[PDB]
Amino acid sequence: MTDRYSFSLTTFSPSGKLGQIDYALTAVKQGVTSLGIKATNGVVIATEKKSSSPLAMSETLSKVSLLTPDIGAVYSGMGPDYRVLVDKSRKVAHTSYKRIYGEYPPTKLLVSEVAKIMQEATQSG
């Protein structure tokens, strides 16, 4: 039984560009407009919470999250995908650094490590 979809769903188009990648870019360019800028003494990351229904609570939804007490994350795509990504990234960051090195990884290595998951998603069938 298992998973019969062992084949990659991302196939090189004859034009030489990935389909699903250029499709996710389109899905990203529409949605919430977020931003973040870097200053000398700190970095500020901002996003707007589009309250879908006025009966909802934007407080419960966390548009920004805490990867580590030093590193935060802001997204502009699909909600649940970002939530799963942030949970997985927190888990793998803990596994890679808190378990082995004893502290919180820096931004440069954490970003590569979290992007590892996405660059595997476009590869794993």
Binding site: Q30, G31, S52, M78, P80
Partner: protein
Amino acid sequence: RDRRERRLIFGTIASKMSLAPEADLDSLIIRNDSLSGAVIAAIMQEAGLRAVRKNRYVILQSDLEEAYATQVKTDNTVDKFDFYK
């Protein structure tokens, strides 16, 4: 889509009609939609008809608020699916 344009045209339509003194169009135009220059007059016509139904001969704020909910609901598109954004 400009707030100033919708304000201007709403005031122009309201001036000829019988808006009550305790009725605010600014409360109606708080949200920025793609409202056309025609729907934002049929909405006031609907509000007037709603007031006439309740036998009031001067439209109140409570009918202007309800008019927005019946003449402009959605364009559907993808806003019905919040997870896209």
